[PDB]
Amino acid sequence: GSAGLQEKERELEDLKDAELKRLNEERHDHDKREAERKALEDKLADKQEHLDGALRY
């Protein structure tokens, strides 16, 4: 693998660095936390399921 024979290049390292920054931010972690809080509230209360709406008019 020399003279650019391999598809991998310097930009490869840069890509990995970007991933590290994203992980550090932990932005997705916050989203999961919010979802958990929503479940606790159970405002929708759509957890309960029965029949098929036949009972309801």
- CB-count exposure of residue 49 (10 Å: 0-12, 13-18, 19+): exposed
DSSP state of 44: S
Which residue in this structure is represented by tokens 């999961």?
32
Q: Residue ranges per domain, the chain?
A: 11-40
CB contact burial 9-36 (16+ within 10 A = b; e otherwise): eeeeeeeeeeeeeeeeeeeeeeeeeeee
- For the chain, where are the E strands, in sequence order? none
Query: By what method was this entry solved?
Result: NMR
Distances in Å between the Cα of 1 and the Cα atoms of 5, 12, 14, 15, 32 are 5, 15, 20, 20, 42
DSSP state of 8: -
Give the torsion sign (CA, 44, 45, 49, 51): negative
Which residue in this structure is represented by tokens 């309801």?
56
